[PDB]
Design an enzyme around this catalytic site. Structure first.
Site, PDB file in Angstrom:
ATOM      1  N   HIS A 200      21.578  57.092  23.546  1.00  0.00           N
ATOM      2  CA  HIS A 200      22.171  57.369  22.249  1.00  0.00           C
ATOM      3  C   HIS A 200      21.580  58.600  21.564  1.00  0.00           C
ATOM      4  O   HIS A 200      22.201  59.125  20.640  1.00  0.00           O
ATOM      5  CB  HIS A 200      22.151  56.136  21.328  1.00  0.00           C
TER       6      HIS A 200
ATOM      7  N   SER B 149      13.670  55.759  17.926  1.00  0.00           N
ATOM      8  CA  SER B 149      14.527  55.736  19.115  1.00  0.00           C
ATOM      9  C   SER B 149      14.002  56.752  20.119  1.00  0.00           C
ATOM     10  O   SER B 149      13.766  57.888  19.749  1.00  0.00           O
ATOM     11  CB  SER B 149      15.942  56.173  18.758  1.00  0.00           C
TER      12      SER B 149
ATOM     13  N   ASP C  38      19.274  52.133  27.870  1.00  0.00           N
ATOM     14  CA  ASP C  38      19.306  53.215  26.907  1.00  0.00           C
ATOM     15  C   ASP C  38      18.322  54.333  27.196  1.00  0.00           C
ATOM     16  O   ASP C  38      17.290  54.458  26.532  1.00  0.00           O
ATOM     17  CB  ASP C  38      19.112  52.661  25.495  1.00  0.00           C
TER      18      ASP C  38
END
Ligand SMILES: CC1(S(=O)(=O)N2CCC=C(F)C2)CC1
Ligand SMILES: CC1(S(=O)(=O)N2CCC=C(F)C2)CC1
Ligand SMILES: [Cl-]
Ligand SMILES: [Cl-]
Ligand SMILES: [Cl-]
Lengths: 695, 697
Positions: B64, B632, B206
């Site tokens: 992402h 993240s 991810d």
């Protein structure tokens, strides 16, 4: 893994003792003496119950006593939402059309029935499974005047293992069973439809009744002179509780299982039964949801129909998940391949021939069965105006004397039942348009109910125009249209009525399909007699139980949780904290009873809380249960009541074909939570006092 | 509570971390005067975190995080978003425009320097102590004359910490030639997709791979065909030992924002204004969108992304409100301020109680205005698409009232009208959303407080919201393409001045700015009082078990690999496996489609050295580390500082963790490095990437 006959307790006792059973064999089931089996009842012909006091007090589920609680509920005394607690025996409410059945004696009559059957002559006779035939045999064995010589008693012979085993049951039936106590619906049905088939569960699913009898304890219908029954056996209530891995056992009346299904029967169950029910109910529920969300009055009118349709819809999703993930088909195929290989080695081809017969019958009835489920799910239960009024031959041969007025009043009564306070013609036109669009896509013109041919012939495929025309021109399309017919009724108008022609047409096809499909049940049944005989002769009646048939069975396992999916564990026990976690005052299903909320806040748990000071609600176990087991007693290693079975988790609904050790659990309400509600919510100390409670 | 610590704080935390299982030397993890593992951490594209994993500048971050770069290189011929991308040679790695990677070269405490400079006070109410402009002028004064030219690639920045009680200067090295190297298909990179957002258990792979490029001397340089991979100061070793329950785990990254020093009145306001309005208005909006998307497959195509975007902060607000209600967030802030007030009373220093009183009084005073601001922002500004319909500028209007500039003004307005009424805009869906959103807005905001055009509902339409909305579209120049073209053919300023959609859009934006401008003055008293409040808290209990709020600066966090109980009788373990991916597979749902190469790896049990002791293939794990947005792509380290995973999310039961950390619920959701290396190997077949990493048994 099984639902065992009482006869099989001897042959299982050693395994049960190794699994933790501490009580003596004959204290649990004695074929010629009093045992715990004598405290188990078939409650109202469907549920299970249990006698818990020397004065005939009975515990069962709230959903089992629901109709009795509703029948005594008024605007002034709403026992359904407020609970009911008779403060004296004289205040306990009688119930019309209720019964409890005790299993007095059970006897193996296989050789007797098999010898009697030798006089048949026709080898395809289905008398070996006939309730009428088996009753004539039961009466022959018991005696000419048996029920008169032994009042309250009756006999019954049932087939087991596909017609390879027969048992005669001597039953004692009591019909004066009075409502004693019940929690409010917020406790007895906490999950409501959302938590149905769900574990973890926080529902206090219980209700209390009492068996009444004549002065001598013999069965008698309701009379003001009836006295509570003093039974030969009742359960002691344990307050020791449950721990992970503890031995648990259940006795009850499981209704049906399909443990000897062929792989072809599992494919059919999946691809016809389940896939059609899932597909048609999703279309139906989808339209209902849109309408209920857009109109609060439509939500009031259709909420119960939406919930009722969702029940078997969910069951089918759960069953299809097991077929897809747990190898149900493959294990049935491995079962039949193993028997076929053994039959080949023995020089006995009848087993392979029997499996082939079942497969050929399943393959042969495929299109017809698809057409039956399509019309049943799609129209018979999918469209409300399918059940609109159809004038009887007596009613039309009355319209064309003042017997015209009597016929119109009979038709009007039926029309008012169809178009009632919960019926919306607009919602029904929308549901029918989507349901018929799917039906017409799946069933060809040559296979359609005759009136549905008009969609192509008269309406150029416009399903909306066809449905609009039915309501616009029908005498049952609106109240004004009915009253205009009732004022000038002609048989010619009824004979051409578009809704009457639709309703008659779909019911003709539904019966034609049913009557064509019925002959196919018998070859499968006869072949199952040979197939199950083959399986028993090969591996024995030891690790393969007879299919459930609404007869008394026992099951054993342990108090144990399970992993539903990767990285998730559902433990073996729920607590009062889980009820409070789920509370939602603006959702009727998860409203919490104020008296119970207060008990939790003040931690007024008495002697019912566990070692950690937490209040238990429910627990789960590896016992093998199905429908018919609602209200079943759950017993300790010592045979003491620890809970009542009330459901099973959805991951285990395929357990009727193949038990799932790693997923299937019986969902039981903890007896400690039952007593806590009787005590702190109902304030009914007299009920606690008449029970025999062990520390 | 269980913080996001400054690198300066590693020394005084080291003993607790070692007692919790840390085995590596203090200065091997962070050394102010030498190479440390801190040197392998990067701020990836100004928001995410990344980490250098090879001597040739290979960087790992989230899928992402690299999503926009994967999308920019994807066409209908080479779709990298859907199939993945694996450069088989360094020359095949794709450059990306407007990308950056920031290294934290040096970090220095400049508190006494900034505090002495601040003493040259013109006003004691000056907000310069928090001003990026002021602090940058101080940073430039300390670094030197033309530092950026004398030291190319480097830059300097001063930031306030602890409400203005601590200042740090960061020396940053920025690289802008960062090329896409590898990425799994979206079916792995975003397996859960929106359904599993903020959800644990989680089965998402991810990750994405990039490479830092530099000039011949390893110095920062923009994209050039002559750029060579960066040989870094430090890179992470990859561990294949895995994780076990209770194992020590640590993270370094750039957490963006926290509100750890909120008063109880600020928690009540966050709940009853911010969250309750966002929950209420988004439920009305999403409800109408859902009914329309379900009834029209073309409306589902057009509104799917807007529906999902609205759901994101909607779910977060539900999770935040659950913590306020169940975890005693308000009470713990009240206990924090009561304890400081009691201590201040005993010391004879009333300024702390006075500071808390100031915050409470400001919160109480701005309540009606803040309610009106969130009501118009959630209800109209975000809630109604025709609120963002074209408004003719002062110069656009002027050009319409005798030159060739009339056709220029109409082409500018037409361009804006085409952006508003685009391929995904439905006027019918918008009228339905606006009718329900305005019905709720008009019920909450009184006539005297309404945007001027909304007064017409009562005055001109007798309270008929449907008639008012119908009139806007029926009479507006932006109500349809035909209505616009008829205006464009004969454009009059008089028509635009009376246009019902223009008057609505202008009116709601006037009120939105009037509310914002009235509310802005209330931020300063709270900020100044927080300087005194946090000063008190630190003087009382110390900068030891109370971390400074996140501010997009480099922080470390530590905890253990551990699951949790979300509700009664349910336990979510610490680790997910490849079986959970296969359990979740749904070929007819774009979110849960399983890549064919991966499904066969699972079937074949082709797990190599990446499987755990039991032969199971791990996917993700969770830990008691304290992370937030900005974390993240963060490296997750072992007791030895070896990479064990990449942080990519946190569970919803922990979204209130920005105010109060929840030990029994809050977990960082990390993708296991063994699953990363499995996908590179068995799905991407990119052995060259495995070969350049330093992998430990
Ligand atoms: C559709 C499901 S359910 O709604 O959880 N459902 C619960 C009740 C009974 C079942 F069998 C299944 C996801 C499987
Ligand atoms: C009903 C819920 S949620 O709102 O869907 N949830 C989703 C993930 C992010 C959140 F913050 C909350 C689970 C609580
Ligand atoms: Cl009895
Ligand atoms: Cl002071
Ligand atoms: Cl917590």
């Amino acid at each position: 893994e099984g639902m065992w006959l009482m006869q099989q307790l001897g042959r299982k006792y050693a395994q049960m003792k190794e699994r933790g059973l501490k009580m003596k064999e004959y204290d649990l089931y004695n074929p010629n003496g009093t045992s715990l089996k004598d405290a188990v009842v078939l409650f109202d012909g469907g549920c299970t119950g249990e006698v818990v006091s020397d004065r005939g007090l009975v515990l069962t589920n709230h959903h089992c006593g629901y109709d009795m609680i509703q029948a005594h509920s008024t605007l002034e005394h709403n026992y359904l939402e407020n609970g009911f607690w008779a403060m004296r025996e004289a205040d306990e409410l009688p119930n019309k059309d209720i019964s409890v059945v005790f299993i007095d004696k059970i006897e193996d009559v296989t050789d007797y029935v098999k010898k009697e059957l030798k006089a048949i002559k026709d080898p395809n006779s289905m008398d070996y499974l006939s309730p009428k035939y088996l009753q004539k045999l039961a009466d022959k064995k018991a005696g000419k005047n048996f029920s008169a010589k032994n009042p309250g008693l009756s006999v019954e012979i049932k087939a087991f293992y596909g017609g390879n085993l027969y048992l005669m049951f001597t039953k004692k039936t009591y019909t004066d069973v009075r409502l004693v106590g019940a929690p409010p619906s917020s406790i007895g049905k906490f999950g409501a439809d959302t938590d149905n088939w769900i574990w973890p569960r926080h529902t206090g699913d219980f209700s209390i009744f009492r068996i009444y009898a004549d002065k001598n304890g013999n069965p008698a219908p309701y009379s003001e002179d009836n006295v509570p029954l003093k039974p030969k056996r009742f359960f002691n209530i344990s307050l020791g509780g449950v721990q992970e891995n503890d031995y648990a056992m259940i006795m009850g009346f499981p209704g049906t299982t399909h443990r000897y299904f062929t792989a072809s029967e599992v494919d059919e169950w999946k691809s016809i039964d389940n896939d059609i029910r899932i597909r048609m109910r999703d279309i139906r529920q989808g339209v209902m949801l849109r309408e209920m969300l857009a109109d609060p009055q439509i939500k009031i009118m259709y909420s119960a129909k939406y919930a009722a349709s969702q029940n078997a819809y969910k069951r089918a999703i759960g069953a299809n998940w097991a077929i897809k993930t747990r190898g149900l088909r493959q294990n049935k195929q491995a079962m039949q391949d193993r028997l076929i290989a053994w039959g080949a080695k023995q020089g006995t081809p009848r087993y392979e021939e029997a499996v082939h017969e079942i497969d050929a019958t399943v393959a042969k009835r495929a299109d017809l069965r698809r057409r039956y489920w399509m019309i049943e799910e799609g129209i018979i239960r999918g469209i409300e105006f399918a059940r609109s009024p159809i004038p009887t031959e007596d009613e039309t041969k009355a319209l064309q004397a003042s017997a015209r007025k009597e016929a119109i009043d009979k038709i009007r009564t039926r029309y008012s039942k169809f178009a009632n306070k919960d019926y919306s013609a607009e919602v029904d036109k929308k549901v029918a348009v989507a349901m018929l669009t799917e039906y017409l896509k799946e069933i060809p013109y040559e296979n359609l109910p005759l009136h549905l041919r008009l969609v192509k012939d008269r309406f150029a495929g416009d399903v909306q125009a066809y449905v609009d025309d039915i309501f616009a021109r029908s005498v049952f399309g609106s109240e004004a249209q009915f009253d205009a017919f009732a004022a000038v009724p002609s048989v010619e108008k009824l004979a051409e009525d578009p809704m009457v022609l639709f309703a008659s047409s779909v019911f003709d096809e539904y019966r034609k399909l049913y009557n064509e499909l019925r002959p196919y049940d018998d070859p499968i049944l006869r072949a199952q007699r040979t197939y199950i005989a083959g399986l028993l002769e090969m591996d024995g009646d030891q690790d393969q139980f007879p299919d459930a048939n609404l007869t008394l069975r026992f099951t054993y396992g342990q108090v144990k949780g399970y992993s539903p999916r990767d990285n998730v564990y559902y433990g073996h026990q729920t607590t009062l904290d889980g009820v409070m976690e789920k509370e939602d005052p603006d959702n009727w299903e998860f409203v919490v009873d104020p008296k119970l909320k207060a008990v939790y806040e003040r931690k007024d748990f008495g002697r019912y809380a566990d070692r950690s000071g937490r209040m238990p609600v429910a627990f789960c176990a590896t016992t093998h249960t199905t429908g018919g087991n609602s209200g079943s007693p759950v017993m300790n290693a010592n045979g003491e009541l620890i809970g009542l079975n009330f459901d099973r988790n959805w991951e285990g609904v395929g357990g009727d074909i193949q038990y799932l050790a790693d997923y299937q659990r019986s969902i039981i309400v903890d007896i400690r939570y039952v007593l806590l509600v009787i005590d702190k919510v109902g304030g009914c100390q007299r009920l606690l006092d008449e029970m025999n409670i062990v520390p």
